[PDB]
Design a protein around this ligand. Structure first.
Ligand SMILES: N[C@@H](CCC(=O)Nc1ccc(OCc2ccccc2)cc1)C(=O)O
Ligand SMILES: [Yb+3]
Ligand SMILES: [Yb+3]
Ligand SMILES: [Yb+3]
Ligand SMILES: [Zn+2]
Length: 607
């Protein structure tokens, strides 16, 4: 299969084996400037020119073997960017490799980067920069074959103001004063494991660290360090469980970076340095499943990688599966089943939101002429997980299926694969059960829109009390309201509180008086746990409670995790009382927002 999201030469023509990156970070001008030395290997005889991906890059020169060579930038093709064709001085034959060094400058409007002014940080004294390349934004930092079908090693030296710290998705390789003059410091990095280019990450800011494990430091601004070190304490014990499930952890260090509130996702599995949203800082470790998730990518995703974005579910379905086994080992099989069932509920929501015949509710998708950031949703996570959970139960239980998963990881490590590679390895591993495998509706699961053709079995132990309470609220009449009491919540974990709200939200609106009484007896306004507050405020807004309007606007703008921010703005726009303020608030904020988030909310709000 070809990668329809890249304009570069396909891996069937040439392959980038290594990147050498030397660049400087300029906050005054909001540019990354430097050279990108690509070691490229030909896959055919008589290769004379190749094409790379770029987006809003300024190219100063292309050097090969000490000399400057010819290159042409084609017309930009919307979200894909502009193809950069490079002429080779000598015609390459199979397995022969050249090193092409490209002098480049990034635009301040790079979709891969957010540049924060000092007022936008916790410290107020220093600026901050962070990248987010997945799915196809690496090209907006430097020219490359921007496709997961290619894996390269890389080494980096980056020059930053000496008061600031730089970190990458690599092993830290020391720091020295920048010899070439300024009171700038230069930081070195090495990534010895080949990775898809979407896993290249950079952060520069006033960073402090704290060690919480033998191979884990936590990084953030000073004011979040102590809280982060506490929140993510369990990290090493999750890594050990993950190593037991997936095989050896090959990356060396597992550091964590806690970004500014505008970081668009819950986390990003950048090798050697996972990124996480500060919205995880609940103060009780209750949102640590996100860490377990990013840890599991150290095998499914980063070692075995989707060959194109059409097969994204391979990355996410398997990682959610491992994530939930980690948490199940830590807190019990009953908790694993509770999280599993909650995930099915999230799938129901996604399918209803898109519509059951919508192409984005298929497991394997076709992103031809679709911006990946627009297609993104929980469908590949939860439909992918549901398929693996169904197969787990079909093939004889978690022990058996986990054996498959480890052999799967071993088999395809360091490779990029398609859904078909996965499936006929499944059939090969389970040759003794092919008759069982032939029972599953593969066409429906892989290719049909909507909910899966069959629902797995879920233990109900921890879910039952959530169902009882949500139903009482959903069906309550006037004479029931006075019976509700804070004692209803007595034996419910925060996880169950969240699930209670999720179930209730599925049936919103509730009558306004009900939602008022709910705050009266449960005081959800006071809970800072982001998942819970998110769903509570959605329920308040969809139920037409005007008092919740400032609370919702505040959460939507004070952080920028798209999971929270997009639906809050969307609920507020749909509420006639808050619509105008919602649009005005977005217009006033969008200049200071992450570029992808700004774009998506603007589409959402239709402005
Ligand atoms: N990878 C991170 C979250 C960030 C992430 O996955 N972003 C991302 C962004 C755009 C993407 O586009 C590809 C795609 C492929 C299939 C369906 C929908 C979207 C895919 C992934 C995590 O799972 O913790
Ligand atoms: Yb210039
Ligand atoms: Yb310049
Ligand atoms: Yb009644
Ligand atoms: Zn993931």
């Amino acid at each position: 299969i070809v990668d329809t999201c890249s304009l570069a030469s396909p891996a069937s023509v040439c392959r980038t084996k290594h990147l050498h990156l030397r660049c400087s970070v300029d906050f005054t001008r909001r540019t990354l400037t430097g050279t990108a030395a690509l070691t490229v290997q030909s896959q055919e005889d008589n290769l004379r020119s190749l094409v790379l991906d770029t987006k809003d890059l300024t190219i100063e020169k292309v050097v090969i073997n000490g000399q400057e060579v010819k290159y042409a930038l084609g017309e930009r093709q919307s979200y894909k960017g502009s193809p950069m064709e490079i002429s080779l001085p000598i015609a390459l034959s199979k397995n022969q490799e050249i090193v092409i060094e490209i002098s480049f400058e990034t635009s301040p409007k790079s979709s891969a980067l957010q540049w924060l002014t000092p007022e936008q940080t916790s410290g107020k004294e220093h600026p901050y920069l962070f990248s987010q390349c997945q799915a196809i934004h690496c090209r907006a930092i430097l020219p490359c074959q921007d496709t997961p079908s290619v894996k390269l090693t890389y080494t980096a030296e980056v020059s930053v103001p000496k008061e600031l710290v730089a970190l990458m998705s690599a092993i830290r390789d020391g720091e020295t004063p920048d010899p070439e003059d300024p009171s700038r410091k230069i930081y070195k990095f090495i990534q010895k494991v080949p990775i898809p280019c979407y896993l290249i990450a950079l952060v520069v800011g006033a960073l402090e660290s704290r060690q919480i494990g033998p191979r884990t430091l936590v990084w953030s601004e000073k004011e979040q360090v102590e809280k982060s070190a506490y929140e993510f304490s369990e990290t090493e014990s999750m890594l050990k469980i993950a190593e037991d499930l997936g095989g050896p952890y090959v990356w060396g260090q597992y550091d964590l970076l806690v970004l500014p509130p505008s970081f668009p996702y819950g986390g990003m599995e950048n090798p050697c340095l996972t990124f996480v949203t500060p919205t995880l800082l609940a103060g009780d470790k209750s949102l640590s499943n996100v860490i377990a998730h990013e840890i599991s990518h150290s095998w499914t995703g980063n070692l075995v990688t989707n060959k194109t974005w059409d097969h994204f579910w391979l990355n996410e379905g398997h990682t959610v599966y491992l994530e939930r086994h980690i948490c199940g080992r830590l807190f019990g099989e009953k908790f694993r089943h509770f999280n599993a069932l909650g995930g099915w509920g999230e799938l129901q929501n996604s399918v209803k939101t898109f519509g059951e015949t919508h192409p984005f509710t298929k497991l394997v998708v076709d992103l031809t002429d679709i911006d990946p950031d627009v297609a993104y949703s929980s469908v590949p996570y939860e439909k992918g997980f549901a398929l693996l959970f169904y197969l787990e139960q079909l093939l004889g239980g978690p022990e058996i299926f986990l054996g498959f998963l480890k052999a799967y990881v071993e088999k395809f490590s360091y490779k990029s694969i398609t859904t078909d590679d996965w499936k006929d390895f499944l059939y090969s591993y389970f040759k003794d059960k092919v008759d069982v495998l032939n029972q599953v509706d593969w066409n429906a699961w892989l290719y049909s829109p909507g909910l899966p053709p069959i629902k797995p079995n879920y233990d109900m132990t921890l879910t039952n009390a959530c169902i009882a309470l949500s139903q009482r609220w959903i069906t309550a009449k006037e004479d029931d309201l006075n019976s509700f009491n804070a004692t209803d919540l007595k034996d419910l974990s925060s996880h169950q509180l969240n699930e209670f709200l999720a179930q209730t939200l599925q049936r919103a609106p509730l009558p306004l008086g009900h939602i008022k009484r709910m705050q009266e007896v449960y005081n959800f306004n006071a809970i800072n746990n982001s998942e819970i507050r998110f769903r509570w405020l959605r329920l308040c807004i969809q139920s037409k409670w005007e008092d919740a309007i400032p609370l919702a606007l505040k959460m939507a703008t004070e952080q920028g995790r798209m999971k929270f921010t997009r639906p809050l703005f969307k609920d507020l726009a749909a509420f006639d009382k808050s619509h105008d303020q919602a649009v005005r608030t977005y217009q006033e904020h969008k200049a200071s927002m992450h570029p992808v988030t700004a774009m998506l909310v603007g589409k959402d709000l239709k402005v």
